[PDB]
């Protein structure tokens, strides 16, 4: 039968349900979630480094003209000097003293080691979960890992599984984030293009081993005053080195949910957001007949002591009176309660130990004891551990949350003001009635 | 100087525009753009193609069971049959009589001529747009890739120009499109893993040469009832060759706004739609300074076979006394008229004849022939033909479509109306003037 269900997409917590058909005995179905990457559609859109910003060499041109031409190569900065005078180790370097022209450019161009010290930069839009799901059933398990889309099954052959649409919609990333040696950030980069000066992108290329280099990094560049040749410039500091500097925190220190990010390709893993409903079919012969089942009569139920809390610290003890011997399963439809075994063995007008696990002070809730119902009403203390170490496994709701007999003093001032209330009414009408006679 | 100037978006139609500034002059701006290439970014979700259903050699042996083992092969079908008993040329391929054993199998592959007849998935995320322009100012010619996206300089050597945000960007594009031998396509194929029988992406793969190939064909193998050794099997109908038979137009004739769209990469040029804000620094040097600009006395105006249309229909003739002589520019400042000339050889005293188109009947307009303003007024006559080869120039307004009849008679209705409304409250409030005494 294909029973849909509700399940949270935490890691780890089992889930437990029980599935039924009226002409057979109930089976327990165990579903746990063990991954979950949150790979979203990521396309790079440039890559940066700090820039070499090696100059060439000088051009010298002497009694005549040297300007120089437009260049196809990343922040050509040109500029031509008259009345200059080179000179290099031995004498001068030309054979005019005043009319010189030297030609001075300057470029720009990645650095020997921007293969490992590089930032790419690319926009991260819709992110879809992928979920691995341990299930077992009549004692049969399988992993299996499928997506949350609503539209593709998994491992179909074994069991057939539909993942619909999740309940909330995370999606750490930004629209548009960096990424530097495993370290993501949620940075509003310029666009290729705007090239500002000083700040991140100052020198961006469409791929590592590019010649689309494009820089606009401010070298203003200056006529010599010394005897010797050398090129003047000055340049605008390296806006990667100063992004650097306060990039702000990476998204393995800031992620919500619990999150943690890997690169290559980029993923959310163990992420727990929301709830996820999923559609399973149980294949038939998985079934086991209910005259095959050995069926109950007698059932009740009364616990010891509970403690509620993300550790399994209640028990019940069940009584019981049965025809047969065989293992039965066991699960509890309240939301608050959740047992610890899948399963029990019952054989013939015994008891059995069974463990919990709730969150309201008051314990009422329903035990599916080889079937029907068994209804469990009693209250126990709150735990004195005040920090633990495993979630939590169920949620809280209001009804549950305010304990039964806050629920009594409550309810008793209410009705006792409400009365007050229709007493007074009452005198009031009655007094009226026979005032008018 | 910053001039910010909205242009329209429609490729070719050149953009007349007048700079002036206080001692800089009047000065010609003309705004064209070449091309436009609207290029967004793609992720490639699976390729397809037509399958092999290639079936292996069967697996039979004698006196024994046989049970297969789950493969990695793309739509792996097993099936275990008894009381085979093979036939080839020659006799029976194996000793024992009746109980026997043979595993049919079958798995799918791709086809020897995907390499060509395939179709990828890509998921069209948001559409930045790209222009090609050219500006000519003065004497001086120049062309530049700018993009639209916003701030991003162009040809910044000598011609700093911002194109601003798209007025509406509408994309041609829908979220999901297939591309098959660069015909384009917008098919809402399934994702990843949602393989359907008999329907497009049947058989889902990352790349036409990887392995981990995946489909869900509705493979049957049914017992083989003659005696000869046969596998036979019932497959679901290529949901490749389905699609390809109703895949509907492409969107090379259906794209709205007419963009020509081109694959390698993904891309829709040259579509006509809203307006584009620009703003562009002219350089100084270009200026004249306002002394040496010859100035006219008194301008004039009159026109000649006027004919309102998306041609250069219209005709005008301007007398001037100019002071001094050489070339000027002129240009109209009418939100519904542009003339053809951007400039103008004014010699002395005489008279130009320009040419100019409009949209409006009662073409009045106010042009600065060359410096000032004048005032032209035309009732100009409706187009003969029917269908014209070259698009429109001008925008129709509410006002400029009402010609100055049409005002004179409406209003004329309407003023008579009023005036009846008027003169009875008057003689109303009078009455009541002359009844209160
Ligand atoms: C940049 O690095 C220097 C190096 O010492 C550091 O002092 C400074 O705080 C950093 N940040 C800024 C914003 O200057
Ligand atoms: C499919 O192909 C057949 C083959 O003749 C053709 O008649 C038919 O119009 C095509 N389209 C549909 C939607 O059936």
Redesign the interface.
Known sequence: FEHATTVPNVPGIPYKALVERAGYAPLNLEITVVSSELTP?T?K?YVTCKFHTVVPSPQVKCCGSLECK?SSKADYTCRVFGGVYPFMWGGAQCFCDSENTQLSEAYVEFAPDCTIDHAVAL?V??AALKVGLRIVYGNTTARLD??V?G????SS?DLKVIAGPISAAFSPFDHKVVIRKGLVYNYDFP?????NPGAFGDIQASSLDATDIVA?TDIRLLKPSVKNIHVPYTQAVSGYEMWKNNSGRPLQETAPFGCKIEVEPLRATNCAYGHIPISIDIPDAAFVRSSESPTILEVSCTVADCIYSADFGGSLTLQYKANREGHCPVHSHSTTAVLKEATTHVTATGSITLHFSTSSPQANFIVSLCGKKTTCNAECKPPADHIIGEPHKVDQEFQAAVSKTSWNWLLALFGGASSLIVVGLIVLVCSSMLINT
Chains 1, 2 share one sequence.
């Open positions: 559609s396309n859109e437009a926009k839009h819709t499928t997506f889309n539209v593709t099954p998994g052959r666009e290729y293009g705007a090239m606009r």
